[model samples]
Target: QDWLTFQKKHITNTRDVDCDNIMSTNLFHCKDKNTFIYSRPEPVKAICKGIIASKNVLTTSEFYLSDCNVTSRPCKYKLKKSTNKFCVNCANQAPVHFVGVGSC
Candidate 1:
């Protein structure tokens, strides 16, 4: 899946990930099947725009994304161990933060 699109589709949007059909191509994380990270994309959208919007932030955070734009597209993001806030999904524009994540 394209990371950008995945971020748009899953990370920011509120939808259940149907991870049941595990194939060599991919696998889902989260020990709790129903558990997921949730967020409203609007604030993220604003931040990405650099539109002077206040998006509720991150903590215990560390999941940044760099060089991620096209979803379902092959890409490499600059890795950061953690930044306490990596809101790539919300911003339709390129993320200013660093990046990485998950078991698939």
Candidate 2:
């Protein structure tokens, strides 16, 4: 699994990280929204272990996170930052997707 890389680059990162550029995969098709978490990968990964092992597993502890909502043609993002428990799609004890911050 690409857990390490995924968490280091995609999930856990500094606050200054630009969501609009990194999240913009294809300019042809726009990505409406994206969420990012700035915290240790350990806690984020731990959610995969104890939670109900189905679709979206949520964290018990809260962490710093940000939500980017696209608003323009140049892929301008309206960034919203907060601290909360996040949800992820886990498979084989690794996170494949971040569903956003919310309760189970």
Candidate 3:
């Protein structure tokens, strides 16, 4: 049950880059292999919806910030990292349906 609870955190992760350690929090994409700069105050749910899915990071469940159509500004994604976590800003009245979060 802990694993399912952990998976529902809605953050994706990657080891597609040259990693010397486990603290690899670098945010990159699958198709283009480019990195993403984290922004603030933008929720992850709506951003996940904006993801094209074709060019997004196909590892976990939903989306990457790079391939999404979000216009909101992102702050550094400092939302407390887990192992191989790909988190979202998750604010701004963003939808909470992803992780079954009732309200954000």
Candidate 4:
């Protein structure tokens, strides 16, 4: 009873250049928007044990993330890369959702 879908939708080290094809696959289906974290799953799971920064939001350790936005007509994606911390929502003692970027 872990966040398997979270891993599939958000975790990957693959280059975002393949974002279109990756997002196109039925595994995740065609995505108009998505974010991929280029880090091992352990660090992400570590957030489950971290203290919440605000409400249910846990600020994750810094990591590289690729934000992919795709266009409908061409099956093309614009990938933006950044290294930063994220705010996440942990439920059932697991990192279950990405809330957004964190300032600290």
Candidate 5:
């Protein structure tokens, strides 16, 4: 049995230059079923873009909720300078996940 969901909305946008020198290979494979969906070369570029964006956001201390665009994609965020690690706090009245980026 093989079940997987790939969403177009979660895919990021990137440029060819950003993908240069990066490995172009499939990261996900199901050997039990002898089936696989190679991460598209173009899509890999989007991953790189997401990483760059994450780094930029982290450095700027500007956090944005995942799927902020409501595209079902993971939250992209910018951490505050005082944050040193990421943590999920649910002890309060509401549940929240906080990722620390710098010194706290």
Candidate 6:
């Protein structure tokens, strides 16, 4: 069946850029490819939260989350390599919801 035909793709490297590998003289010249910095705290937070909530919802059933939205100040997360985890900051901003569809 079509469902059985699906395959997964994997990546061997998922680490962020390492600053220590480059020499000091070239450090300043190293251009960042991710130019679209998601600095808009409100939007970023809303979107990320929505995405996470949607994933949670999807885990319990066959339906998928769609058309999600948020309006609160964007949340920020600090990545800690030593712990291999992220820290979330939820501030006092409010969250907004957008329209979406789900199906079983």
lDDT of 5 at 58: 24
TM-score top scorer: 4
Compose the digit string of candidate 6's lDDT tens values, residues 1-104.
Answer: 11111100100022232322221124223332111111233333342343422221211222111111212323222221211111122222212221222311
TM-score of every prediction relative to native = 0.29, 0.73, 0.17, 0.77, 0.15, 0.19
Q: In model 2, what lDDT does residue 80 have?
A: 80
Full ranking by TM-score? 4, 2, 1, 6, 3, 5
The per-model lDDT (C-alpha) reads 0.31, 0.68, 0.28, 0.71, 0.22, 0.21
* lDDT (Cα, tens digit) per residue for candidate 3, span 3-100: 23222322335323222221233322212222221223233333445443222222243233322221223321222211322433222233222222
Clashing residue pairs in candidate 5 (N, C-alpha, C atoms within 3 angstroms): 57-78, 61-79, 66-75, 82-103, 85-100, 86-99
Clashes of each: 8, 0, 8, 0, 6, 5
Clash pairs of candidate 2?
Answer: none
What is the C-alpha lDDT profile of model 1 across 1-103, one tens digit per residue? Answer: 3335444333423233233321112333222221223455444434345423323223234333222222232331221222234433223243333132331
At residue 3, candidate 5 shows an lDDT of: 11
Top lDDT model: 4
**Model 4 misplacement above 4 A:** 15-17, 50-55, 72-74
Q: Is candidate 4 or candidate 6 better by lDDT?
A: 4
Candidate 3 vs candidate 6: which has greater TM-score? 6
Against the true structure, candidate 3 has what lDDT?
0.28
The TM-score that candidate 3 achieves is 0.17
| Tens-digit per-residue lDDT, 1-95, candidate 2 | 34665564447467665766666655213477767788777767776774345467777778888777788656777778888877777876777
For candidate 6, which ten residues in a row score worst on lDDT? 3-12
The pairs that clash in candidate 1 are 2-71, 2-72, 2-73, 5-71, 64-98, 64-99, 65-98, 65-99
Off by over 4 Å in 6: 1-32, 53-104
Candidate 5: list runs displaced more than 4 Å.
Answer: 1-30, 33-35, 38-40, 52-104
